[PDB]
């Protein structure tokens, strides 16, 4: 079936890093510069064996056809209320971008406010980020070209939809936020740098500073308004209070929720923005999260996890801010996680819960905290809302893993409060019906017991036949709750799989609590949750090791890939999409060092003692037992992911394919994909997307022969 | 975001 060789490719054993003692060789550590003919020639080399793989087989253009026939259904935002006008994003189905139309009223006719389709040939330039004015009448949007994540941040008058002069260059990782007077906008920007800043490079971002950008001016006249020279990798992000007055600032370093908070009373300034802003340091150090959500005066409504884990409401005033003297407005649930809080039509909070990886949302008075309103929803995710201080509606949308969209709205001056279905699409294909979403527990290793979603059709025998897809993420207080995603319901209906969802440690499913039992010392948890998973699904017989697939993205990446390295006799198929497969180097890239809050750093000998325990690139290792080789696997990852550097997919790869791949053994193959005009995956075009999820399950098919069911 |  290996109709191919693999390139050979040069072994630099030179390469020899001494880690507290430890002598660690990196003999592709040529692979790390991007711009060398040798590493463009391997990419290449390797693209022409992956390829023809992923193409010989006719199930890949029968999996895009349907993809392509079910994923052509509209897609839409909620609507949302600027000034005197309203905004919704809308795709007819198969656009590469969502278009941003624009209306007088919701009874009134749209019009195409922002096509980012006419901006490439190729739907590669994408929307990333934007602000409105606070009259709603200016607009500031980042645009992001091949899907890196620097982003050029150009300006709109609404009324005419005219393009203004103003660009800002340098953008990444940054706020948006004008001052209630219209005058101008603070985001982030990032200081002139040697080489490339395309997306390409691999080069560390540190040193970004906050600026303010006066309308009508040139980026270099921008005022400088905080700036952390002695800490390099503080991000300071500013928002205004919701009556103008305050600049709030929000102070991170790596990815822990957790930031310092210091406000500017705009007031108190004697001249306006004109330099470094008078700070109030209210909170000045990284123990908690503090999430503006409004304020009435000096009193100051806050999500916080200080000593919550499960997240609170906190009331701090400016006039009296001793952390003694703080109010709980909405006390911590003992297991329910409150998500996010926003405050609309003035003294009201709409509150999103995740209750068992299932979201509830409830409308609270913001006097009191007290309950008013349950907004019913069926089982799965709130994945868009809006509704600010000055709205009197709010419109929010549901998905599951069988039903697209249902936006809800509700007028929000009413007595009696009537939530309605706004807007319902329907996939024509699916009958969801026909399926059945069911969530278990399994107890992991430790005997912890963790949730797992588990999507198949009804009816099925429980006799280990059916291929399986089991995704997890486990990481950065990341919830993974249910979605719709027509390319894995293809893959349930059309080649009679089941779908699994495992809720591992590491993500924020159980709260703070739940993210540090996977992080740090702990990481090997999220392994051992995820191999459980794959137990507990062969042992209640949805599937069988040789039919069982495993997939996940980023930190998900380096999930799969170190659950092949550990339990190869446990998977068939393992397909890893940008993942960090360098545990040891990681923090040296781009913006890789924020992760060292999750991961640990190999600078740091303890640290280095768990990490290169499970570090994919460090435990590639012919399995010992005669019978046992590698799954068969696929990386997929792009030129232009300036977020997970694909160096560590080449090197990965490279090193498969020397130590397991040239054993006489391994017969299940071992790719890698590099995409080009692409990214991490924000701003994907949807053709790319459909290419995507095509490679992906022609793979499986022709990995597992699955054959399709018309 | 600049999570992984």
Redesign the interface.
């Known amino acids: 079936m290996l109709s191919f060789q693999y390139p050979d490719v040069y072994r630099d054993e030179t390469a020899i890093q001494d880690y507290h003692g430890h002598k660690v060789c990196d003999p592709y550590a040529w692979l790390e510069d991007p711009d060398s003919e040798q590493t463009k020639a391997f990419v290449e080399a390797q693209n022409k064996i992956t390829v023809p793989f992923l193409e010989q087989c006719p199930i890949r253009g029968l999996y895009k056809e349907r993809m392509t026939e079910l994923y052509d259904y509209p897609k839409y935002s909620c609507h949302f209320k600027k000034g005197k006008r309203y905004f919704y994003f809308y795709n007819t189905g198969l656009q590469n971008q969502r278009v941003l139309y624009v209306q007088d009223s919701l009874e009134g006719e749209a019009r195409v406010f922002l096509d980012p389709n006419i901006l490439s040939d190729d739907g590669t330039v994408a929307l990333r980020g934007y602000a409105f004015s606070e009259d709603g009448e200016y607009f500031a949007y980042g645009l992001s070209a091949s899907g890196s994540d620097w982003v050029t941040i150009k300006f709109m008058k609404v009324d005419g939809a005219k393009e203004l002069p103003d660009v800002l260059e340098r953008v990444k990782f940054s706020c948006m936020a004008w001052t209630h007077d219209g005058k101008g906008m603070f985001y982030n920007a990032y200081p002139q740098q040697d080489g490339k800043s395309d997306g390409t490079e691999t080069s560390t971002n540190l040193h970004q500073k906050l600026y303010y950008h006066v309308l009508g001016t040139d980026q270099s006249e921008d005022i400088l308004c905080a700036e952390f020279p002695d800490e390099p990798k503080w991000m300071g992000g500013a928002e205004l209070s919701d009556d103008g007055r305050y600049v709030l600032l929000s102070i991170r370093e790596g990815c822990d929720p957790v930031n310092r908070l210091w406000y500017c009373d705009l007031q108190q300034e004697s001249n306006g923005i004109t330099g470094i802003l008078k700070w109030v340091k209210l909170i000045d150090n990284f123990e908690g999260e503090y999430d503006y959500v409004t304020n009435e005066g000096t009193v100051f409504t806050f999500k916080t996890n200080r000593h919550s884990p499960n997240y609170r409401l906190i009331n701090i005033d400016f006039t009296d801010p001793e952390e003694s003297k703080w109010k709980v407005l909405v006390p911590e649930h003992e297991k329910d996680v409150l998500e996010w809080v926003a405050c609309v039509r003035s003294n009201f909070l709409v509150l999103c819960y995740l209750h068992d990886v299932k979201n509830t949302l409830q409308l609270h008075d913001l006097a009191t905290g007290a309950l008013l309103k349950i907004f019913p929803l069926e089982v799965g995710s709130v994945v868009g809302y809006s509704g600010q201080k000055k709205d009197t509606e709010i419109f929010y949308q549901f998905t599951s893993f069988l039903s697209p969209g249902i936006i809800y709205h509700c007028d929000l001056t009413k007595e009696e409060l009537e939530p309605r279905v706004f807007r319902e699409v329907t996939v024509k294909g699916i009958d969801a019906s026909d399926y059945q979403t069911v969530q278990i527990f399994y107890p992991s290793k430790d005997g912890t017991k963790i949730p797992m979603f588990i999507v198949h059709k009804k009816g099925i025998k429980l006799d280990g036949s059916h291929p399986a897809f089991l995704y997890g993420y486990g990481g950065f207080n990341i919830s993974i709750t249910p979605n719709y995603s027509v390319s894995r319901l293809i893959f349930v209906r059309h080649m009679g799989g089941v779908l699994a969802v495992a809720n591992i440690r590491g993500g924020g499913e159980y709260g703070e609590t739940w993210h540090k039992g996977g992080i740090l010392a702990n990481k090997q948890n999220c392994f051992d949750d995820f191999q459980c998973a794959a137990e507990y699904l062969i042992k209640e017989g949805y599937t069988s090791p040789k039919r069982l697939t495993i997939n996940g993205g980023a930190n998900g990446g380096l999930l799969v890939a170190t659950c092949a390295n550990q339990r190869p006799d446990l998977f068939g198929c393992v397909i890893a999409q940008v993942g960090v497969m360098d545990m040891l180097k990681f923090h040296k890239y781009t913006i890789g060092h924020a992760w060292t809050t999750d991961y640990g750093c190999s600078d740091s000998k303890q640290h280095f003692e768990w990490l290169i325990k499970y570090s994919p690139l460090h435990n590639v290792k012919l399995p010992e037992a005669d019978d046992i080789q590698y799954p068969s696997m696929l990386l997929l990852t792009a030129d232009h992911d300036d977020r997970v550097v694909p160096l560590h997919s080449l090197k990965f790869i490279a090193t498969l394919q020397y130590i397991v791949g040239r054993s006489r053994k391994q017969n299940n193959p071992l790719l890698i994909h590099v995409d080009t005009k692409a990214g991490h995956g924000a701003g994907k075009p949807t053709a790319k997307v459909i290419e995507e999820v095509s490679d992906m399950f022609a793979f499986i098919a022709r990995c597992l022969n699955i054959d399709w069911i018309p | ?4």
Request: charged content about 25%.
């Open positions: 975001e600049f999570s992984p």
